[PDB]
Structure 1
Amino acid sequence: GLSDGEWQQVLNVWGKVEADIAGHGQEVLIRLFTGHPETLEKFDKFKHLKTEAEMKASEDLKKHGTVVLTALGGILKKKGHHEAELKPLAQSHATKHKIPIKYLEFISDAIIHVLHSKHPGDFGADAQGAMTKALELFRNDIAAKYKELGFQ
């Protein structure tokens, strides 16, 4: 449950991401994969990436980063009214990709890390609070769908 002012902060922060969705998406995934190498194993199409240099050079990783952040941005712009947008992602990530909710926590924190890394001094405490709450809401609603599906 975010206030109007918190959603305003979220969407203000998101404008930073939308200016360079592929660069943000790439860095989010690289942060996820390098911080939590087990997550790489969930991607048949990225498990060949042995080094961060290879990850950085991967155009397909940037492409997927764009897909991920485009989806997330579409969800965030719903300001919590995202059941229709979230449902297929929860279902695909539980049933097809088999992504534990822990990895969604990892990527949520990776987003925060990337925002500070790319916008140092420009991702204020209020913005971090609002973005964190929005990612918690996202993760929590996914978690509810995971529970429905019995997925761990």
Structure 2
Amino acid sequence: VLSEGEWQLVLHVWAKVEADVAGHGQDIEIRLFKSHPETLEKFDRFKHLKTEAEMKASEDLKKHGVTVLTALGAILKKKGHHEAELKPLAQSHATKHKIPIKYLEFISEAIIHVLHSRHPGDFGADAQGAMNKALELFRKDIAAKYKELGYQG
């Protein structure tokens, strides 16, 4: 569980993300694909993108990044009370996209990296620890929902 203080650090940095959701989304997706190239294989829509500049130029990827971060933001703002928001995400990611928890670890790393790159003065060690706990909770709860659907992490 996160403390109220921890949730407030999470939401304080998230408000920074909300000042440019598209830009943060692009950076996070690109960081994910750069650091863990195998993840790009999961995207029939994007795996044709051959360079970083192509990725940055893709309106489709940018739109998708906003969708991703909008869903994550909606989850984080519930401060753990996110069953209604998490269930449909688990459904699609378990049964359609087939995303293992290890890949959710990869994107969590990418999120931390981008938030620190863009907002170091509002994302120090304690804030990173809080965001890490929030994303750990998300991964734990989604893994439980995966199993409920018959998908083994």
Instruction: Settle same-fold status: TM greater than 0.5.
Output: yes
Residue 40 of structure 2: aligned partner: 40
Residues 1:17 and 2:5 aligned together = no
Match for residue 86 of structure 2?
Answer: 86
- What amino acid maps onto 2:87 in structure 1? K
- Identical columns (%): 87
Alignment of 1:137-148 (within 5 A): 137-148=137-148
Q: How far does residue 124 in structure 1 lie from its aligned partner after superposition?
A: 1.1
Deviations 1:22-72 (A, max 9, x none): 111110000001111111111111010011111111111111110000000
SS of the residue corresponding to residue 120 of structure 2 reads: coil
In the aligned structure 1, how far is the partner of 2:36 from the partner of 2:11?
Answer: 27
Moved more, 62-71 or 52-61: 52-61
**How many angstroms apart in 2 are the aligned matches of 1:89 and 1:44?**
18
Alignment of 1:43-82 (within 5 A): 43-82=43-82
Who is 1:124 aligned against? 124
Structure-2 residue corresponding to 1:110: 110
Query: Tell me, which stretches of 5 or more residues in structure 1 are unaligned?
Result: none
Separation (CA, whole Å) in 1 of partners of 2:74 and 2:58: 24
Residue 147 of structure 1: CA displacement?
A: 2.0
Contact 2:13 2:122 in 1 (8 A): no
Kindly provide the CA deviation profile for residues 82-125 of structure 1, in whole angstroms up to 9, marking residues without a partner as x. 00100000110010011111110000010000011112343111
TM-score (norm 2): 0.96
In structure 1, the partner of 2:3 is 3
Partners of 1:35 and 1:57 lie apart in 2 by: 19
Tell me the CA shift for residue 148 of structure 1. 2.2
Counterpart Cα distance in 2 of 1:118 and 1:8: 19
Unaligned runs of 5+ in 2: none
* AA aligned opposite 1:27: D
Query: RMSD in angstroms over aligned alpha carbons?
Result: 0.9
Instruction: Tell me, in whole angstroms, the C-alpha distance in 1 between the residues paired with 2:10 and 2:102.
Output: 22
Amino acid at match of 2:138: F
Greater CA deviation, 78-87 or 54-63? Answer: 54-63
Q: TM (normalized to structure 1)?
A: 0.96
Distance 1:12 1:127 in 2: 9
Aligned AA for 1:58? S
